[PDB]
Amino acid sequence: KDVMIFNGLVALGTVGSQELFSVVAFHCPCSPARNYLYGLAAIGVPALVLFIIGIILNNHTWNLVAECQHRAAPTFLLLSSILGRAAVAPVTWSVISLLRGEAYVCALSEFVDPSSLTAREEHFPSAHATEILARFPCKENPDNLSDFREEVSRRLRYESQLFGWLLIGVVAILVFLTKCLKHYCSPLSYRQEAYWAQYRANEDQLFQRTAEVHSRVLAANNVRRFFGFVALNKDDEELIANFPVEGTQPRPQWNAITGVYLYRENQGLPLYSRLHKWAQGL
Amino acid sequence: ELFSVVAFHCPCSPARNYLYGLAAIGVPALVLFIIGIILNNHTWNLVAECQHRRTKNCSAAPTFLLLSSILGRAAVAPVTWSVISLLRGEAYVCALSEFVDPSSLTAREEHFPSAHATEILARFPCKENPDNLSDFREEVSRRLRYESQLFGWLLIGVVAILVFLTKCLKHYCSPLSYRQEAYWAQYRANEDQLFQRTAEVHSRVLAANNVRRFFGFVALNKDDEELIANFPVEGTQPRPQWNAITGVYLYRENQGLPLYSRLHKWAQGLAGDNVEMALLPSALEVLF
Amino acid sequence: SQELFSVVAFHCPCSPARNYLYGLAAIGVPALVLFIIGIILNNHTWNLVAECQHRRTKNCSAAPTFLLLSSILGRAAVAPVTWSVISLLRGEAYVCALSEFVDPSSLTAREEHFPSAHATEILARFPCKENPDNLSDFREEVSRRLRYESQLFGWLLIGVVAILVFLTKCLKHYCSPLSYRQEAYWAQYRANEDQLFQRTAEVHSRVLAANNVRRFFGFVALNKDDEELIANFPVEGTQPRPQWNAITGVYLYRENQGLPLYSRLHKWAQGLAGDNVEMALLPSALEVLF
Amino acid sequence: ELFSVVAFHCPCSPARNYLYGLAAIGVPALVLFIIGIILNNHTWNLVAECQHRRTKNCSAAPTFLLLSSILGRAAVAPVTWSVISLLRGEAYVCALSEFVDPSSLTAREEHFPSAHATEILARFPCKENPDNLSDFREEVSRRLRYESQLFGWLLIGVVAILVFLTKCLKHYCSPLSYRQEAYWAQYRANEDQLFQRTAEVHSRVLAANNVRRFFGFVALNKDDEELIANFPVEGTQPRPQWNAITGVYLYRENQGLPLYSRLHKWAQGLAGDNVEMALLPSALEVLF
């Protein structure tokens, strides 16, 4: 549906940015206590920015803030909806980075155990043990150590991709569990819930279209009042001709159609939104 | 693209590669198994059936066939992934490389070192093998890749028989002829397409009236004005009315005439004091 | 699909007593799958099962049943045969499977330079080229002897099938009591009935589904052509289960009053196919009162 | 790549490559011969004629001409294939390679070995020959390719004479005139074209009537509605009416006017107690 169109573009775009980021801007600072922080900041920091960004562009969060400022089940839906639309961006960035393996080996190369390697006896100085290991990802080490470097550069690569798949498995289970909890703990059937979601999308599509039209007509009327004439095209001149000016809505009425919805019904007939509650109420 | 990121990379380390093979194959098989459950609407009305009863009223027999259909329609995606991952051979030669016995190896004289048997064997998938052992690298690879593809064809054969045995048993044990079930299937698809499509139109017409009540007018396109004119809404459907068409249904017959869905069961009138989640208290309590 | 074709590519395991198990699996499994698909998609096997469903008493004897399986298996076996032929003509599946059974003493095109210590092991590895260069001539001598037998069986299998089809179609016309022209008209009727019946089933379900959706919301959103269907083709009810059960099953040319009947639906429409209540939604009306 | 599958591959082995050449050429000719008989409709009415009589009543005089037409018409495809396979020359150099006499070889001094003459000769078509005998190889190849093309061209010469002699005797011995047999041919090709067309229409209208009896209506296309309105059916033709138009017909005349087919002969009324293959027993037995 429309959800897959938005999620698909976001999922693809993050992978493209991650691939672009890795080829143009990623260089391991091969040295102890530096690349570990650099590798950690190459996964969590980009994910955290996307998580905050995903929240800000969502319309429902600011509605939640306004309701809380004016102040269970209604909060369950939004948190299952905003995260389902905002936590996509960090998760895809997180998994591709782990599956790629560049960032993890950039981070844990410092903590590699020199004595845990195989195919030869342990060959590492007592003092420069971490210094030699930390320089493995940069591939600047002498070719004499390439026998040992390949084992480390592939062991940590295995650990990176293993964590990448386990994160996907954890996320896939959570999405399944969220779906079950949303339907099982909901007070209304899923057939009505699908109808409820369709009504909300349709109301906002018409509300946005009408508000823009009403503003233009109201602005046009003020131009007529101020100047005595209006220079409008055929469509704009029609809009006022078909849409009489209702006036200014009272301040409580705008406050009556804002906030969160608890799905309260009035004597059998359901009301699916605050605007529907206000329209049916009066 | 994604294939570059999700490309299989065998970690040539003993007792470590098959764990990666399990994760690189068993996780996509799990995800495709989860997606099949989520997309299948038959798993949600089963939940809705358990939601309203709250007492485990239904027996195992109605649930066993219902639960089987959900898994069967969703297990296809893991199988068509498990088969491909087995016919490729990469995920199995990597997993079973270290378990190859050097004693049974052939196609070369017995030059296999015994100092590190498992370590050397586990390094075959990555071509990190001495050239004196290169005759065994192709010998071990062909033996394991054969078993990978042999298991793939047996998995296809077993699946292609379970599908045959399932369909044969479904028809034989069904109380209806295969033609009536064909008509029944053509009804449910037609009902779902029509029911969802009016639910979208009904919402838009209802939303327009709410918008009209607010701004005094609605901005409709050419086709939307037809929807409002052609289809005028008079109210909204009660929650128990919605709850009468959600759940599972097993061909209940009324007066010799078949019923094909809960909506059809409700339309015939065979489905339809205490007030819950009301906006406002009892009308007497509203006064007080 | 370049990637998906390499999946089903034939990779011969050059190992003894091992390359024919793979050859059997890589060829016998796709042949089995194509056999199953032919059975599933054939409607003549589901009314045979449906015949065994309502009769439940072995009413059909060997005479009608054996003439139904022969039609089901004859139509199904077309796909496995045309795959078992292509595999034989390619020659890859047979040289791989039989490379270990070539007699080393029977080899030719060179003097007896063939080793005798590990003879089965070297022979089995011929299809993968993994052979010493001193036996390159022996490799191609085997590679042509076995590919010849693979294609020799490939052409004999085509020849044998082309005779069975001739014998079957010749005996089918000779033994049938009907003329070949009436069986051609009968085949045209069964094609037209099975097409119109499906076409009306879709319409009669959509119109029935439209009524139920209308009963819920009060209106139905219908396309330009769908709105015509509602007015042109109104429905009033659903056909009873025994009425559906009277048109599903096998049928072998029963004739009434000197006039042929060409299908169970045709036999039912003439009225020649038409107390205890089964699988009812609610108990008897007398029990409803209590 | 069907052509690449059926591409000729000569097994260069004595006493073995002519078995393949026989099979790789004789089986495709056999298949084309069988297909030619099956598709021809003059053999099924011949079977039908031998079906209703059950006693070999018809003499060999009319039977021989019908069989000659079936075999002669069907044998075109094997001949036009057995000619192509001979003009190419690949199938014949492979088959006759071992039978070349080394003593008769020329274009080189008599250096041809006599140790294994057949074994060396049989490998000539596969180019696997020593460079010291390549003079003989290209000499043998041109000798055996010539015999293939010589046989291929003489086969066309024989066929082009048999076709000429068959047609001349078909006109000299037939009692009709060539301008009437042309009219007769233009009729049989028009009766069959119309009869097969009306059979599809009559079946569809009959099939529509039965479906209407089931659902109460028939979903018909724009053009199928014309068939029901223009062409109403009232019943099915009896089995003896279908038997009266199937068989072999040889130009009988009635009262001086010719009859061109047994459907035409039946239409004039010149073709048309015991009940067979009945659904239900006699009406007297039904009562009890």
Added chain:
Amino acid sequence: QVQLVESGGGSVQAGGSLRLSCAASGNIRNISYLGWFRQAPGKEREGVAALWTTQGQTYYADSVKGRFTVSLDNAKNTVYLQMNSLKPEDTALYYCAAATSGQYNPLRGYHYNEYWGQGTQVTVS
């Protein structure tokens, strides 16, 4: 297997007394249901009364309690009723039916046996 014989139809004014006899012939050994139903043109069919042989309790409709009473002849294996205070609402086709206390397997649904008998009864006024 079970045939029901019914008689007693007639045309009587308001307040008339009528008695309807439902004679059951066949295998009534497994019958657990005995009662009467009425239907008139332009509306569906309703049940005036019903009796259980096995449990023994009896049903009457809202317009039947104190107005019509149904009796069972156990020895004769027949159903008798009494019609009192005839009304124009009573002009309907009366039928007597039977059932076998159908079981319920959750996979298929309710299955039982049902029988009917055709009768008429119309009050002129």
